[PDB]
Amino acid sequence: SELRDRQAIFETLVAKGRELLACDRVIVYAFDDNYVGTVVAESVAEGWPQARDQVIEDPCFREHWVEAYRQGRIQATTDIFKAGLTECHLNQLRPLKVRANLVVPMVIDDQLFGLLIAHQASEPRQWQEIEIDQFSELASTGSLVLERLH
Amino acid sequence: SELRDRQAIFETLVAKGRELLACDRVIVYAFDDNYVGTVVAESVAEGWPQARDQVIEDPCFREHWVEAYRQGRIQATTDIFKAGLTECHLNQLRPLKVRANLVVPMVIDDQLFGLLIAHQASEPRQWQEIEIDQFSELASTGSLVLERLH
Ligand SMILES: *[C@H](c1[nH]c(/C=C2\NC(=O)C(CC)=C2C)c(C)c1CCC(=O)O)c1[nH]c(C[C@H]2NC(=O)C(C)=C2[C@@H](*)C)c(C)c1CCC(=O)O
Numbered sequence: 001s002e003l004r005d006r007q008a009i010f011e012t013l014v015a016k017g018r019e020l021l022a023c024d025r026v027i028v029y030a031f032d033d034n035y036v037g038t039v040v041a042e043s044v045a046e047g048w049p050q051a052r053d054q055v056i057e058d059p060c061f062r063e064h065w066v067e068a069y070r071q072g073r074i075q076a077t078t079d080i081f082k083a084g085l086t087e088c089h090l091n092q093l094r095p096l097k098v099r100a101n102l103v104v105p106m107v108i109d110d111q112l113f114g115l116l117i118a119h120q121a122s123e124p125r126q127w128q129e130i131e132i133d134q135f136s137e138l139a140s141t142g143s144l145v146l147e148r149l150h
Numbered sequence: 151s152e153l154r155d156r157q158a159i160f161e162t163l164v165a166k167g168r169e170l171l172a173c174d175r176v177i178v179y180a181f182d183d184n185y186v187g188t189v190v191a192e193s194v195a196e197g198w199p200q201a202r203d204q205v206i207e208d209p210c211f212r213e214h215w216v217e218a219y220r221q222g223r224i225q226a227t228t229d230i231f232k233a234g235l236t237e238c239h240l241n242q243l244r245p246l247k248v249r250a251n252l253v254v255p256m257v258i259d260d261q262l263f264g265l266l267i268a269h270q271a272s273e274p275r276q277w278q279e280i281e282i283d284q285f286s287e288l289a290s291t292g293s294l295v296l297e298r299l300h
């Protein structure tokens with residue numbers, strides 16, 4: 001019954017992450033072999049759309065950033081409307097409602113498994129260094145558990 | 151599969167915990183029905199004794215501290231030789247070269263499962279508030295995962 005164990009870990013990570021940051025949504029965004037992402041687990045505050053089990057293909061990861069995320073890159077955005085993003089990027093976030101986000105990597109067996117992502121849905125938010133470090137550690141601990149369970 | 155699964159999580163906690171604190175040893179100290187402890191997992195720096203698989207019958211947990219640890223007690227000692235401990239207690243720690251320690255509980259299903267314990271052996275160490283927080287959160291994250299792998 002290993003498959004249900006993996007899902008239980010994903011659910012623990014999103015619930016604990018939303019509690020740590022007191023934000024509107026936390027998701028696990030997992031990659032397939034095309035680096036298309038699926039929202040495999042979600043904790044979301046009542047009143048905002050559920051991204052659970054949506055499939056979002058964003059080519060920037062495979063084209064530009066996979067190796068960087070494997071080496072510990074993050075994305076911290078206080079206000080996505082002031083970040084100089086293209087309409088294509090904004091259009092993919094608009095159905096979910098994202099005003100600020102924090103993106104940290106999940107690396108398992110030296111591969112980029114996915115991203116643990118926090119959203120503030122309607123207000124900007126300056127993420128503080130301690131919040132980034134706690135959220136990164138949560139992702140790193142969860143990834144290591146998954147690596148050792150096989 | 152249960153025991154092998156649980157062991158994978160214990161091995162993760164001790165490796166991550168020693169990395170976080172840059173200390174000399176981290177162990178999971180697991181209680182049986184009588185609160186006799188077994189060192190079921192260990193991460194230890196080269197050159198120090200291994201506590202792995204040792205059974206330590208220390209009665210203070212069952213007689214005095216079970217309730218306080220269930221309710222979140224954390225114990226941090228900068229120098230065990232200046233803390234007023236008795237010879238009986240110190241003789242448990244002297245073979246392992248312990249000089250400072252940090253003790254946090256693992257509570258699963260509202261029951262004291264065990265303790266996650268960090269040791270400095272090279273010298274005394276004043277544990278800092280941020281380090282205690284990260285170590286306690288590691289124990290909490292690990293406990294929540296074990297709780298959900300029923
Ligand atoms: C790279 C990029 N995409 C994302 C995507 C997400 N943020 C989220 O919160 C979620 C969950 C819903 C997703 C998915 C991030 C965070 C980043 C930044 C990576 C980084 O710099 O660290 C990115 N994607 C686009 C989309 C755009 N590019 C295209 O080729 C096409 C087609 C697009 C529309 C679908 C853009 C503009 C970027 C940033 C620029 C770049 O790195 O190439």
Ligand SMILES: *[C@H](c1[nH]c(/C=C2\NC(=O)C(CC)=C2C)c(C)c1CCC(=O)O)c1[nH]c(C[C@H]2NC(=O)C(C)=C2[C@@H](*)C)c(C)c1CCC(=O)O
Pocket residue numbers: 179187206207208209210211214215223225235236238239242243246248251253267
């Ligand atoms: C309570 C006590 N024991 C421990 C044990 C350990 N610390 C470690 O680092 C390890 C791993 C090697 C172990 C095992 C701790 C941390 C504590 C303190 C609890 C707290 O304050 O939260 C304790 N045990 C003894 C042993 C002693 N008492 C006896 O009756 C007999 C017999 C003993 C010899 C085996 C003592 C003196 C204490 C502290 C005093 C007390 O709280 O009662």
Ligand SMILES: [Cl-]
Pocket residue numbers: 042043044045
């Ligand atoms: Cl939810």
Ligand SMILES: [Cl-]
Pocket residue numbers: 047048
């Ligand atoms: Cl609504």
Ligand SMILES: [Cl-]
Pocket residue numbers: 216220260261262263
């Ligand atoms: Cl108990």
Ligand SMILES: [Mg+2]
Pocket residue numbers: 001002005151152155299
């Ligand atoms: Mg199982």
Ligand SMILES: [Mg+2]
Pocket residue numbers: 170
């Ligand atoms: Mg650190």
Ligand SMILES: [Mg+2]
Pocket residue numbers: 213214
């Ligand atoms: Mg007594």
